[PDB]
Design a protein around this ligand. Structure first.
Ligand SMILES: [Ca+2]
Ligand SMILES: [Ca+2]
Length: 497
């Protein structure tokens, strides 16, 4: 009875619900099992003294020793860390079994490797080598599976990168990334939920139950959310149903569920964030994920007033979390301009006049002007200009309004039709004035049609001279406020003292 057994060998690869996944697509951190099966040992074999299955596991597959042993009864399991290689030896019991009756066939048992796939866009190939009686052995077939995240994949023609994307826009739908945005304007952010690569996924139940989320780490120091304008649409153009919207002031403030999901995925937001959520993972998965249908989230956010006084930049970033795996969007930067309106006293109406600083004391009965310098509105800005007003509340004890004002361009203003209004040009014709002589105050209002004719790509600044007569001795306060696009901005003296 010489001639040791020479069974055929079949390696099999399965997900955590014991479904075959050979040559498919499975999500990152999926549990992936390998079964090292052998054919039945034939009647008239020799005594099997040793039956060892060596399996050098693929790069990026993380071996779970305890689970493996749990799944591989009748086998001693040993693992070399250096080489990521598991070895199974049939125990004395299993060999007693193979040898009990050499005159009749016997079924083998098999060891199962339990582990997870750690990396995105990767192909994981596996085989194993039986050797019998510390002599002859044989290498198995090759099985494999792929994680989504990689283009030109032969097994999954839809596989591309997982890239959630973010873009900023004005209400016309024009791209406003990188541009100046005036306090009160809204950022009509469009977040993409990138699912197309997940098409024909074959992950287990346990993996899908880890859920689907989307985070917008908005800058709460600069923006407040218009939550009521959010519009989740699929890539076929349809409304999206199962996703709920929440916002939270900080990570510490938000439920145990969300802290966990963000913590697991490795996402720690800066202060406040907006978070979307698949209400039923399974349904979401079955409708959009498995079908490779990108989502679109429109999440508009308005710029706080309090930011026009400081100015400075803000940035928005998004994250998608599929099966508990975290991916970052591109970062979109905008900046708010400091609107810095200035007030001076001058004896002339000449916009090019000498820039004297001298403590301007106005002799009794002198005709003078308050020079009300408007805020600088920088080139390449969000929305159209539609309001630009100079309010001026004067003290009637000391100052009498003459009924005469003029307005001047203070920088080169470019209109839409391409014509350019040079700095210094009289713009008075494009204004009117609200006067209340009784209260002691007036507002010079640029005309809406004229402002809306200013290119959004042009800088804009004007100044008003309002003519007064000083009618008493003593010194006299004067208040001026410049209002742009419905946002008030206090003036300071042009010369600090
Ligand atoms: Ca993609
Ligand atoms: Ca934030």
């Amino acid at each position: 009875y010489k001639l040791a057994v020479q069974p055929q060998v079949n390696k099999e690869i399965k997900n955590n619900n014991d479904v075959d996944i050979d040559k498919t697509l499975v999500a990152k951190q999926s549990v992936v099992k390998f079964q090292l099966k052998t054919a039945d040992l034939p009647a008239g074999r020799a005594k099997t003294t040793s039956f060892v299955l060596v399996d050098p596991l693929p790069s990026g597959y993380q071996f779970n020793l305890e689970a493996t042993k749990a799944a591989s009864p009748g086998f001693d399991v040993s693992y070399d860390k250096a080489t990521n290689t598991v070895t199974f030896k049939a125990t004395a019991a299993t060999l007693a079994t193979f040898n009990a009756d050499l005159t009749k066939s016997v079924a083998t048992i098999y060891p199962t490797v339990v582990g997870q796939v750690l990396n995105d866009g990767a192909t994981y190939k596996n085989n194993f080598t039986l050797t019998v009686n510390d002599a002859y052995g044989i290498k198995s077939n090759v099985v494999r599976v792929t994680t989504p995240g990689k283009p030109n994949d032969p097994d999954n023609p839809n596989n591309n990168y997982i890239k959630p994307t973010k873009v900023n826009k004005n209400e016309n739908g024009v791209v406003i990334d990188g541009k100046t945005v005036l306090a009160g304007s809204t950022n009509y952010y469009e977040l993409t939920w990138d699912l197309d690569q997940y098409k024909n996924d074959r992950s287990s139940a346990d993996t899908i139950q880890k859920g689907f989320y989307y985070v917008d780490d908005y800058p709460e120091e600069a923006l407040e959310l218009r939550q009521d304008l959010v519009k989740i649409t699929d890539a076929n153009g349809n409304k999206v149903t199962g996703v709920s919207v929440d916002h939270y002031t900080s990570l510490e403030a938000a439920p145990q569920e969300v802290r966990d999901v963000l913590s697991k995925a490795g996402i720690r937001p800066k202060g406040a964030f907006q978070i979307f959520r698949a209400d039923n993972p399974r349904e979401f998965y079955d409708t959009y994920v498995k079908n490779g249908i990108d989502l679109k989230i429109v999440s508009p956010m308005v710029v706080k007033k309090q930011m026009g006084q400081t100015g400075g930049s803000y940035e928005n970033q998004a994250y998608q979390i599929d099966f508990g795996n975290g991916y970052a969007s591109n970062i979109v930067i905008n900046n708010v301009p400091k609107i810095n309106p200035k007030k001076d006293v001058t004896l002339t109406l000449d916009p090019a006049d000498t820039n004297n600083v001298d403590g301007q004391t106005i002799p009794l009965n002198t005709v003078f002007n308050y020079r009300l310098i408007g805020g600088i509105i920088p080139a390449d800005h969000s929305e159209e200009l539609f309001e630009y007003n100079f309010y001026d509340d004067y003290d009637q004890t000391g100052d009498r309004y003459t009924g005469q004002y003029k307005v001047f361009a203070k920088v080169d203003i470019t209109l839409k039709d391409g014509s350019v209004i040079k700095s210094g040009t009289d713009l008075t014709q494009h204004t009117t004035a609200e006067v209340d002589a009784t209260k002691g105050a007036l507002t010079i209002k640029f005309k809406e049609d004229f402002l809306r004719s200013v290119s959004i790509d042009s800088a804009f600044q004007a100044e008003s001279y309002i003519q007064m007569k000083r009618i008493a001795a003593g010194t006299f306060e004067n208040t001026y406020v410049n209002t742009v696009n419905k946002v008030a901005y206090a003036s300071e003296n042009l010369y600090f003292q």
